Amino acid sequence: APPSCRECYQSLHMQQYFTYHTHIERSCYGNLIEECVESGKSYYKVKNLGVCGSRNGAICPRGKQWLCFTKIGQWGVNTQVLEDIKREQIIAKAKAS
Amino acid sequence: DQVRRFLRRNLLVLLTVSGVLAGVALGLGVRGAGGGLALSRAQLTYFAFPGELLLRLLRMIILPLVVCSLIGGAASLDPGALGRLGAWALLFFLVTTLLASALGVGLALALQPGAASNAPSKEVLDSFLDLARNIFPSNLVSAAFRSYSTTYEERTITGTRVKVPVGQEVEGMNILGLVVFAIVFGVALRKLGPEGEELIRFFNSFNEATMVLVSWIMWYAPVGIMFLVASKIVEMEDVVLLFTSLGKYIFCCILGHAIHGLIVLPLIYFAFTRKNPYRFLLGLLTPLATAFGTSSSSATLPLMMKCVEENNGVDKRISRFILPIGATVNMDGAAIFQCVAAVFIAQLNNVPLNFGQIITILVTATASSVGAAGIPAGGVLTLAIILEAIGLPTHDLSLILAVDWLVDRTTTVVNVEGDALGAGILQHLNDK
Amino acid sequence: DQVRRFLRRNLLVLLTVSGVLAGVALGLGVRGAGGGLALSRAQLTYFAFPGELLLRLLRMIILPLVVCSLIGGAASLDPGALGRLGAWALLFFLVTTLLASALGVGLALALQPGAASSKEVLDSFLDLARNIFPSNLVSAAFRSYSTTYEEVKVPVGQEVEGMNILGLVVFAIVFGVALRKLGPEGEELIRFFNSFNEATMVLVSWIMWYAPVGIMFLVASKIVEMEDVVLLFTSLGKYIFCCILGHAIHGLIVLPLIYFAFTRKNPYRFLLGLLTPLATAFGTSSSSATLPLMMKCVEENNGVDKRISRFILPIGATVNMDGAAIFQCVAAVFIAQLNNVPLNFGQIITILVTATASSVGAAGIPAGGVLTLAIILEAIGLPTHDLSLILAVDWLVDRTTTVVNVEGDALGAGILQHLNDK
Amino acid sequence: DQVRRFLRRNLLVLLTVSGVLAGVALGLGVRGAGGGLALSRAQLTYFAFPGELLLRLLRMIILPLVVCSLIGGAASLDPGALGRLGAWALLFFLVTTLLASALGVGLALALQPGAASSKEVLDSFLDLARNIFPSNLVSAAFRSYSTTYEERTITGTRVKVPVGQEVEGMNILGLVVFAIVFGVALRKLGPEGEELIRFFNSFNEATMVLVSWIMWYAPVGIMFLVASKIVEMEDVVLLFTSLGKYIFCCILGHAIHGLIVLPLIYFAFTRKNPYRFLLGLLTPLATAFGTSSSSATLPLMMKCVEENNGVDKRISRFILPIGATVNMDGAAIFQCVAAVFIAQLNNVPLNFGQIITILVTATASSVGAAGIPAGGVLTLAIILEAIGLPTHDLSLILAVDWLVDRTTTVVNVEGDALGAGILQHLNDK
């Protein structure tokens, strides 16, 4: 039972709605990665280290405190980060049992 | 003693085949150790490390080759810009390369050489917009290591799904923008005056130095090829599936070569200056056999051009102008091989491809031809260019080089056939 | 036909004016009964896409242009031809550019163009002074230093995205001076940089040939996005009036005032001896195209002399563009006021200094202010969405700023000549 | 008038020493009053701002100088006029630099000057190997490869996966090796290779001129740096003792190297009386101790070694520029011991992996330095940035230069002389 990630929410001017990106660069976030579930769908939430706008030469979302990934990125010219995510998911699934 | 001298004079081929065979044997043996594979992914990385070093070296060399050879080739475009026949030759070569590459990618997609075995995706129109935005990079230095991609963001407004793009600067070198900038810069230098010759001499010297680096890297290659093959064998289960996929890819490439060189080019001959191409084919039966046997485009050029001049009839001047400049520019079989190989690599990793990536493949396969005067096109180097352009892992480059020995002959024969047919049709057009 | 020859002589100007007019007409027609503002953000982006291509092409070419033009100009410079006067000329150019930029900002703040009814000042000054000296030239081509707060809020630098034009211009100037001081061994490097700059110039010319369709699509998209076109048109009118008043009162007061303070030799008589180069600069906006005719006029009308003129005019036509600084400052402040973001003293000083340095680093392009404006807008951090308005009306302000630049360098030549007279 | 010649002869050195002394005085004075209110980090940054500007200038002038000096050298030094014995000389220079850097590591670990009372080893080796062959040359100009471990959560137990984030830095290994291999390729190329050689050499002279300009501004930046670091520390006496330990370790390492390594390199080759052979030459060591440039002493070195003892012109002309431009072993041990001192004062962990990485980067990063007197701090700053260490005591390790840098250039001249003697005793056989 993963925790329900409230920090993924965003406030729009009053109404609060859940939002989450698809591809975020590896340099934008650190090491502590947590798994959260919203309405039965699992996502990854993390502190955002790209508040200023960029980190380690990689662009990051601006003005966001808690990033909120999807478990597996998108195939749209995501270079190799997506393959690395695939390997990490398969080894995590193997190690879960 | 000539056996030893032959080995010394041909050390590269012997070392490469020894490396491939040793890699296959090592992979099979370490897969057969115990009941099955049990080594950790850390040990997978440690085993595949030399291949990673090789791939890093190749990419480090891809960057200067792209930025320099395209500039040189674009700036050296004056032999075809001084006459209408040269412009027709350049246009014919470009159109034939596009059509051949499209046929290759279509046949590879249809026959499905790989496969034999949720994450969101982009949109077709947004992929086209990304492709067009990558043509002109926002920054020249930032384009050396970063590209553009429309990252999508999702919002859940009280149950209503909202799907909005972001379009940030995704890390990863884009070669297509570098190719376009290099081509337009070379054209600008050609339109410039005498100082253009000094600047292009600078660029040509830089390209030659990088080519020497390529030679040294290919000298180092066999151990990295061995380790890449071994790591691929260890990681990919059902080695029989990998071998039969390689065989299907070989058959796909040969079929693409055959359909191109026996339908598309004769169709072009029948269209332009309408007459039967079989006569010219029977006439030139000799040079095609020499090209198929020797598998060298430059070595067969004098014999092929003299045979063209003697058999049937040619203005000789049109042939004497076209054949030396069409031998290392056309690269029809290179386009077939590069497109089919890129599709096969993308399908071996179960990586779906959208329309933007396919058009990128076609455009970069074409654009490598105008820079082929300074780079060894038709090999795995241009395939590496394409793979880095579309963003796929390049651990299968060694596996493709393992069959390059057996799918390069038809490449050369179809390139020679295309050059000969183009020379014939342009001679008949000029005769009027 | 004579009209055919006339349109052949100047086709770019007619093409871009017709493109702007066609963009306005198409945008009003689409917003009228073609779905209105009901188009979503994605469809508006698809509509504005050719303008995005034009903006990306403009941003691509500014870096090689500045880095090689400044190096070639500084290497070809010989301050030792006239001792103890090149320093006076450089000081004069610097102070007149700073005064022009201050004038541009002050009038932009006072007149409030497009005004519909956070870093501390010390940190901003420190970051501005720190950005002049970069830490890595390759990293400085796409990243600039900036201070963020995280913990009493202790400040930490982050090197956010954005081209750093201050460091690039300063390094180019210093490198050119070093190449000149090197001697006969560095002739090749100079020739290489000049050739690369000429190639970049012809690339610029091709891009500005392509520009009118991009301007048309930008103005169409921006006029169909807004639901109140009267506000946008009035804001554009306020912008044009503000900038024209700025770099008209500047050229008609500040330069004559300093001329009269220095040598009191009737500066208006000096201007009224210099009619036809001003008309040439008002016809074509290329500063470099007006150099020889203005040389002939200033030689035959005033005793500026020839040594002094070819010492100061080629330099003054590339690094002395005070009107360009005025236009950049007014445009950036107008963009900031359109987004209703507050302006503090620190970023006003930062934008002034970066606009001055980038005006030094600009070129004598027929439209050379837009690229620099985009770079300085990205440098301090502002959304890049209102550039369509400035690009759509760039023609009138562009001819006027070319006139300002040529009159500024002419006044500089005259004042240097009278100082040499002693 | 009579002392004007002495003032002109050593004006930059005198100005630097006066700046360091004035910075110490300013730090002591500003800490003398109620500096607790001025002890805030904002005020400390205000004091250290010009020093930050000087360090930024050094950091931005790193890459041109290193890459183009190495390209011009490797495309010019390799041809020479000799054969297989040139390979012997290059191997001796490389092994001497490696052994000197290892001796620096050993003495830094043994003495432990930094007294004030992580990644796996194999992963560190792999990150060092990947940094040698960079993936992208342009990306290598401002960042380097690095491996870090993650703790991604899957509804329970802890996992540990490396990702290799490629953190910001500067991989001197990749740039140096690429410049060297490019220079060798340009050598092997031909005449347009010589045109590229002239291009890169002219660019390098321009960079040298700019560095000479920057070292004129250096004293005010270093004096503000000294003042800021003195007022920052809790006690001024707890820092001077650490500086004394550090300078003692550096001088001891230099003396041990230059006085027991090279005679041991001779060992049983005593047909050329090693202490007498060294006492044959004193003028260049005295000159290189007076000034601090390896390049400025090159002509006097060549003439003395040629006309004093037995050596050939064709081999001295080939070997001496190598020592003056590639063989800064003293700078290597200087930057190595300084980096280990920085690491140990900052309480960072130490292990085999990162210490072998710092050994390799110190022994392969000194070759990119030049003969400019204050030319070791630049490479040192880049090494400490690339080894994942904060810039904390860079100000004080820059302050202590006026004797350690002289010792470095002295031992570099001595190493070059011993290499030339070795080659001469090998050629005649």
PDB file of N, CA and C in Angstrom, chain B residues 42 45-46 49 52-53 55-57 59-61 63-64 141 144-146 171 173 198 201-202 204-206 208-210 212-213 216, chain D residues 120 122-123 126 129-131 133-139 142-143 145 166 178 181-182 184-186 188-189 192-193 195-196 199-200:
ATOM      1  N   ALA B  42      25.506  -5.752 -12.094  1.00  0.00           N
ATOM      2  CA  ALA B  42      26.823  -5.149 -11.937  1.00  0.00           C
ATOM      3  C   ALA B  42      27.863  -5.918 -12.739  1.00  0.00           C
ATOM      4  N   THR B  45      27.448  -5.165 -16.413  1.00  0.00           N
ATOM      5  CA  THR B  45      28.114  -3.917 -16.775  1.00  0.00           C
ATOM      6  C   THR B  45      29.626  -4.100 -16.843  1.00  0.00           C
ATOM      7  N   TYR B  46      30.196  -4.832 -15.883  1.00  0.00           N
ATOM      8  CA  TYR B  46      31.635  -5.071 -15.890  1.00  0.00           C
ATOM      9  C   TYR B  46      32.058  -5.878 -17.111  1.00  0.00           C
ATOM     10  N   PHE B  49      31.767  -3.537 -20.288  1.00  0.00           N
ATOM     11  CA  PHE B  49      32.560  -2.307 -20.228  1.00  0.00           C
ATOM     12  C   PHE B  49      33.408  -2.007 -21.465  1.00  0.00           C
ATOM     13  N   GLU B  52      31.284  -0.599 -24.113  1.00  0.00           N
ATOM     14  CA  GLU B  52      30.875   0.758 -23.778  1.00  0.00           C
ATOM     15  C   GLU B  52      31.974   1.756 -24.113  1.00  0.00           C
ATOM     16  N   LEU B  53      33.229   1.405 -23.819  1.00  0.00           N
ATOM     17  CA  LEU B  53      34.345   2.273 -24.188  1.00  0.00           C
ATOM     18  C   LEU B  53      34.410   2.472 -25.697  1.00  0.00           C
ATOM     19  N   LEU B  55      31.924   2.278 -27.875  1.00  0.00           N
ATOM     20  CA  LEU B  55      30.813   3.117 -28.320  1.00  0.00           C
ATOM     21  C   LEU B  55      31.035   4.581 -27.954  1.00  0.00           C
ATOM     22  N   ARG B  56      31.600   4.841 -26.771  1.00  0.00           N
ATOM     23  CA  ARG B  56      31.925   6.215 -26.398  1.00  0.00           C
ATOM     24  C   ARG B  56      32.934   6.817 -27.367  1.00  0.00           C
ATOM     25  N   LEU B  57      33.954   6.040 -27.745  1.00  0.00           N
ATOM     26  CA  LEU B  57      34.930   6.524 -28.718  1.00  0.00           C
ATOM     27  C   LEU B  57      34.273   6.836 -30.058  1.00  0.00           C
ATOM     28  N   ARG B  59      31.127   7.698 -30.674  1.00  0.00           N
ATOM     29  CA  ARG B  59      30.324   8.925 -30.612  1.00  0.00           C
ATOM     30  C   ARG B  59      31.208  10.173 -30.569  1.00  0.00           C
ATOM     31  N   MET B  60      32.285  10.108 -29.776  1.00  0.00           N
ATOM     32  CA  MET B  60      33.245  11.202 -29.703  1.00  0.00           C
ATOM     33  C   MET B  60      33.818  11.527 -31.073  1.00  0.00           C
ATOM     34  N   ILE B  61      33.921  10.532 -31.949  1.00  0.00           N
ATOM     35  CA  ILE B  61      34.372  10.796 -33.311  1.00  0.00           C
ATOM     36  C   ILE B  61      33.223  11.192 -34.249  1.00  0.00           C
ATOM     37  N   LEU B  63      30.879  13.301 -33.604  1.00  0.00           N
ATOM     38  CA  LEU B  63      30.651  14.749 -33.570  1.00  0.00           C
ATOM     39  C   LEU B  63      31.531  15.537 -34.556  1.00  0.00           C
ATOM     40  N   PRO B  64      32.871  15.418 -34.553  1.00  0.00           N
ATOM     41  CA  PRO B  64      33.658  16.209 -35.513  1.00  0.00           C
ATOM     42  C   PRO B  64      33.467  15.786 -36.958  1.00  0.00           C
ATOM     43  N   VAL B 141      26.182  25.538 -29.941  1.00  0.00           N
ATOM     44  CA  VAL B 141      26.934  24.759 -28.962  1.00  0.00           C
ATOM     45  C   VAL B 141      26.017  23.785 -28.234  1.00  0.00           C
ATOM     46  N   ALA B 144      25.328  20.385 -29.782  1.00  0.00           N
ATOM     47  CA  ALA B 144      26.345  19.344 -29.792  1.00  0.00           C
ATOM     48  C   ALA B 144      26.047  18.237 -28.793  1.00  0.00           C
ATOM     49  N   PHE B 145      25.209  18.502 -27.792  1.00  0.00           N
ATOM     50  CA  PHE B 145      24.887  17.497 -26.791  1.00  0.00           C
ATOM     51  C   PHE B 145      23.428  17.494 -26.353  1.00  0.00           C
ATOM     52  N   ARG B 146      22.568  18.322 -26.939  1.00  0.00           N
ATOM     53  CA  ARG B 146      21.172  18.386 -26.534  1.00  0.00           C
ATOM     54  C   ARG B 146      20.289  18.496 -27.766  1.00  0.00           C
ATOM     55  N   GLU B 171      18.131  16.022 -23.175  1.00  0.00           N
ATOM     56  CA  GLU B 171      19.550  15.768 -23.375  1.00  0.00           C
ATOM     57  C   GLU B 171      19.761  14.665 -24.405  1.00  0.00           C
ATOM     58  N   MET B 173      22.599  14.285 -28.160  1.00  0.00           N
ATOM     59  CA  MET B 173      23.081  14.996 -29.338  1.00  0.00           C
ATOM     60  C   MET B 173      22.147  14.790 -30.524  1.00  0.00           C
ATOM     61  N   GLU B 198      40.587  29.073 -48.026  1.00  0.00           N
ATOM     62  CA  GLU B 198      41.392  28.891 -46.822  1.00  0.00           C
ATOM     63  C   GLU B 198      40.575  28.252 -45.707  1.00  0.00           C
ATOM     64  N   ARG B 201      40.024  24.659 -46.517  1.00  0.00           N
ATOM     65  CA  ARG B 201      41.258  23.913 -46.294  1.00  0.00           C
ATOM     66  C   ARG B 201      41.432  23.584 -44.817  1.00  0.00           C
ATOM     67  N   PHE B 202      41.139  24.553 -43.945  1.00  0.00           N
ATOM     68  CA  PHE B 202      41.100  24.298 -42.506  1.00  0.00           C
ATOM     69  C   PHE B 202      40.179  23.127 -42.178  1.00  0.00           C
ATOM     70  N   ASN B 204      38.957  20.748 -44.134  1.00  0.00           N
ATOM     71  CA  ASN B 204      39.391  19.484 -44.721  1.00  0.00           C
ATOM     72  C   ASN B 204      40.541  18.870 -43.936  1.00  0.00           C
ATOM     73  N   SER B 205      41.483  19.696 -43.473  1.00  0.00           N
ATOM     74  CA  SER B 205      42.562  19.175 -42.640  1.00  0.00           C
ATOM     75  C   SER B 205      42.021  18.607 -41.333  1.00  0.00           C
ATOM     76  N   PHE B 206      41.061  19.304 -40.717  1.00  0.00           N
ATOM     77  CA  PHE B 206      40.450  18.781 -39.497  1.00  0.00           C
ATOM     78  C   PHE B 206      39.751  17.450 -39.754  1.00  0.00           C
ATOM     79  N   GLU B 208      40.439  15.254 -42.097  1.00  0.00           N
ATOM     80  CA  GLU B 208      41.440  14.213 -42.321  1.00  0.00           C
ATOM     81  C   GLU B 208      42.057  13.735 -41.009  1.00  0.00           C
ATOM     82  N   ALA B 209      42.321  14.659 -40.080  1.00  0.00           N
ATOM     83  CA  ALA B 209      42.830  14.246 -38.774  1.00  0.00           C
ATOM     84  C   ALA B 209      41.824  13.362 -38.046  1.00  0.00           C
ATOM     85  N   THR B 210      40.545  13.739 -38.091  1.00  0.00           N
ATOM     86  CA  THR B 210      39.526  12.911 -37.459  1.00  0.00           C
ATOM     87  C   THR B 210      39.423  11.549 -38.144  1.00  0.00           C
ATOM     88  N   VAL B 212      41.974   9.940 -39.446  1.00  0.00           N
ATOM     89  CA  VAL B 212      43.081   9.172 -38.879  1.00  0.00           C
ATOM     90  C   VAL B 212      42.685   8.599 -37.521  1.00  0.00           C
ATOM     91  N   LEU B 213      41.974   9.397 -36.718  1.00  0.00           N
ATOM     92  CA  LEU B 213      41.454   8.881 -35.450  1.00  0.00           C
ATOM     93  C   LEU B 213      40.493   7.714 -35.674  1.00  0.00           C
ATOM     94  N   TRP B 216      42.579   4.606 -36.269  1.00  0.00           N
ATOM     95  CA  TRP B 216      43.117   4.041 -35.031  1.00  0.00           C
ATOM     96  C   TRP B 216      42.030   3.342 -34.214  1.00  0.00           C
TER      97      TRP B 216
ATOM     98  N   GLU D 120      31.978   2.831  -4.577  1.00  0.00           N
ATOM     99  CA  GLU D 120      32.751   1.601  -4.546  1.00  0.00           C
ATOM    100  C   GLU D 120      34.053   1.773  -5.326  1.00  0.00           C
ATOM    101  N   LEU D 122      35.584  -0.402  -7.449  1.00  0.00           N
ATOM    102  CA  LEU D 122      35.471  -0.798  -8.849  1.00  0.00           C
ATOM    103  C   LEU D 122      34.682   0.229  -9.648  1.00  0.00           C
ATOM    104  N   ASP D 123      33.630   0.790  -9.051  1.00  0.00           N
ATOM    105  CA  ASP D 123      32.879   1.844  -9.723  1.00  0.00           C
ATOM    106  C   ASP D 123      33.739   3.083  -9.930  1.00  0.00           C
ATOM    107  N   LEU D 126      35.904   2.347 -12.922  1.00  0.00           N
ATOM    108  CA  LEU D 126      35.126   2.470 -14.151  1.00  0.00           C
ATOM    109  C   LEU D 126      34.849   3.928 -14.493  1.00  0.00           C
ATOM    110  N   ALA D 129      37.988   5.291 -15.976  1.00  0.00           N
ATOM    111  CA  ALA D 129      38.198   4.809 -17.338  1.00  0.00           C
ATOM    112  C   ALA D 129      37.263   5.497 -18.325  1.00  0.00           C
ATOM    113  N   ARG D 130      36.001   5.705 -17.941  1.00  0.00           N
ATOM    114  CA  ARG D 130      35.064   6.387 -18.828  1.00  0.00           C
ATOM    115  C   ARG D 130      35.425   7.853 -19.008  1.00  0.00           C
ATOM    116  N   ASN D 131      35.950   8.497 -17.964  1.00  0.00           N
ATOM    117  CA  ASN D 131      36.362   9.891 -18.091  1.00  0.00           C
ATOM    118  C   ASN D 131      37.522  10.048 -19.062  1.00  0.00           C
ATOM    119  N   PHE D 133      37.943   8.394 -21.961  1.00  0.00           N
ATOM    120  CA  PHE D 133      37.359   8.436 -23.300  1.00  0.00           C
ATOM    121  C   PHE D 133      36.006   9.132 -23.227  1.00  0.00           C
ATOM    122  N   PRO D 134      35.949  10.448 -23.412  1.00  0.00           N
ATOM    123  CA  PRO D 134      34.674  11.154 -23.269  1.00  0.00           C
ATOM    124  C   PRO D 134      33.703  10.804 -24.383  1.00  0.00           C
ATOM    125  N   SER D 135      32.413  10.827 -24.042  1.00  0.00           N
ATOM    126  CA  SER D 135      31.384  10.548 -25.037  1.00  0.00           C
ATOM    127  C   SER D 135      31.235  11.706 -26.013  1.00  0.00           C
ATOM    128  N   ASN D 136      31.236  12.937 -25.507  1.00  0.00           N
ATOM    129  CA  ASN D 136      31.091  14.127 -26.333  1.00  0.00           C
ATOM    130  C   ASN D 136      32.154  15.139 -25.941  1.00  0.00           C
ATOM    131  N   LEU D 137      32.882  15.649 -26.937  1.00  0.00           N
ATOM    132  CA  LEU D 137      33.943  16.614 -26.664  1.00  0.00           C
ATOM    133  C   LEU D 137      33.385  17.928 -26.134  1.00  0.00           C
ATOM    134  N   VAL D 138      32.301  18.423 -26.733  1.00  0.00           N
ATOM    135  CA  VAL D 138      31.712  19.678 -26.280  1.00  0.00           C
ATOM    136  C   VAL D 138      31.128  19.520 -24.883  1.00  0.00           C
ATOM    137  N   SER D 139      30.451  18.399 -24.628  1.00  0.00           N
ATOM    138  CA  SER D 139      29.920  18.149 -23.293  1.00  0.00           C
ATOM    139  C   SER D 139      31.035  17.944 -22.279  1.00  0.00           C
ATOM    140  N   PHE D 142      32.539  20.977 -19.874  1.00  0.00           N
ATOM    141  CA  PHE D 142      31.933  21.502 -18.660  1.00  0.00           C
ATOM    142  C   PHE D 142      31.310  20.449 -17.753  1.00  0.00           C
ATOM    143  N   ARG D 143      31.434  19.159 -18.059  1.00  0.00           N
ATOM    144  CA  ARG D 143      30.913  18.132 -17.168  1.00  0.00           C
ATOM    145  C   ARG D 143      31.655  16.828 -17.417  1.00  0.00           C
ATOM    146  N   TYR D 145      31.759  12.319 -16.335  1.00  0.00           N
ATOM    147  CA  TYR D 145      31.004  11.151 -15.910  1.00  0.00           C
ATOM    148  C   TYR D 145      31.208  10.877 -14.425  1.00  0.00           C
ATOM    149  N   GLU D 166      26.370  11.669 -14.576  1.00  0.00           N
ATOM    150  CA  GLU D 166      27.287  12.566 -15.288  1.00  0.00           C
ATOM    151  C   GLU D 166      27.195  13.993 -14.734  1.00  0.00           C
ATOM    152  N   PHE D 178      42.509  13.477 -25.677  1.00  0.00           N
ATOM    153  CA  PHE D 178      42.046  13.831 -27.012  1.00  0.00           C
ATOM    154  C   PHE D 178      42.998  14.810 -27.678  1.00  0.00           C
ATOM    155  N   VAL D 181      46.161  12.759 -28.720  1.00  0.00           N
ATOM    156  CA  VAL D 181      45.940  11.905 -29.881  1.00  0.00           C
ATOM    157  C   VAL D 181      45.696  12.745 -31.135  1.00  0.00           C
ATOM    158  N   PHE D 182      45.041  13.902 -30.998  1.00  0.00           N
ATOM    159  CA  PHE D 182      44.852  14.788 -32.140  1.00  0.00           C
ATOM    160  C   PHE D 182      46.177  15.363 -32.615  1.00  0.00           C
ATOM    161  N   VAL D 184      49.107  13.869 -32.325  1.00  0.00           N
ATOM    162  CA  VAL D 184      49.809  12.785 -33.010  1.00  0.00           C
ATOM    163  C   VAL D 184      49.233  12.575 -34.408  1.00  0.00           C
ATOM    164  N   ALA D 185      47.904  12.646 -34.539  1.00  0.00           N
ATOM    165  CA  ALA D 185      47.284  12.516 -35.855  1.00  0.00           C
ATOM    166  C   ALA D 185      47.710  13.644 -36.786  1.00  0.00           C
ATOM    167  N   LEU D 186      47.782  14.872 -36.267  1.00  0.00           N
ATOM    168  CA  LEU D 186      48.197  16.004 -37.089  1.00  0.00           C
ATOM    169  C   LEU D 186      49.660  15.887 -37.499  1.00  0.00           C
ATOM    170  N   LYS D 188      51.084  12.943 -38.027  1.00  0.00           N
ATOM    171  CA  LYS D 188      51.066  11.915 -39.058  1.00  0.00           C
ATOM    172  C   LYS D 188      50.370  12.368 -40.333  1.00  0.00           C
ATOM    173  N   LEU D 189      49.698  13.518 -40.320  1.00  0.00           N
ATOM    174  CA  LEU D 189      48.867  13.891 -41.459  1.00  0.00           C
ATOM    175  C   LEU D 189      49.700  14.460 -42.606  1.00  0.00           C
ATOM    176  N   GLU D 192      48.974  20.302 -44.555  1.00  0.00           N
ATOM    177  CA  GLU D 192      47.826  20.991 -43.976  1.00  0.00           C
ATOM    178  C   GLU D 192      47.724  20.704 -42.484  1.00  0.00           C
ATOM    179  N   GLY D 193      48.266  19.566 -42.049  1.00  0.00           N
ATOM    180  CA  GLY D 193      48.497  19.369 -40.631  1.00  0.00           C
ATOM    181  C   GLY D 193      49.408  20.431 -40.049  1.00  0.00           C
ATOM    182  N   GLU D 195      49.637  23.466 -41.251  1.00  0.00           N
ATOM    183  CA  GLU D 195      48.813  24.671 -41.191  1.00  0.00           C
ATOM    184  C   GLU D 195      47.957  24.688 -39.927  1.00  0.00           C
ATOM    185  N   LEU D 196      47.350  23.547 -39.590  1.00  0.00           N
ATOM    186  CA  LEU D 196      46.617  23.443 -38.329  1.00  0.00           C
ATOM    187  C   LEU D 196      47.539  23.639 -37.132  1.00  0.00           C
ATOM    188  N   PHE D 199      47.969  27.305 -36.739  1.00  0.00           N
ATOM    189  CA  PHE D 199      46.733  27.845 -36.174  1.00  0.00           C
ATOM    190  C   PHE D 199      46.675  27.641 -34.662  1.00  0.00           C
ATOM    191  N   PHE D 200      46.869  26.397 -34.217  1.00  0.00           N
ATOM    192  CA  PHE D 200      46.765  26.093 -32.793  1.00  0.00           C
ATOM    193  C   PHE D 200      47.873  26.767 -31.998  1.00  0.00           C
TER     194      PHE D 200
END
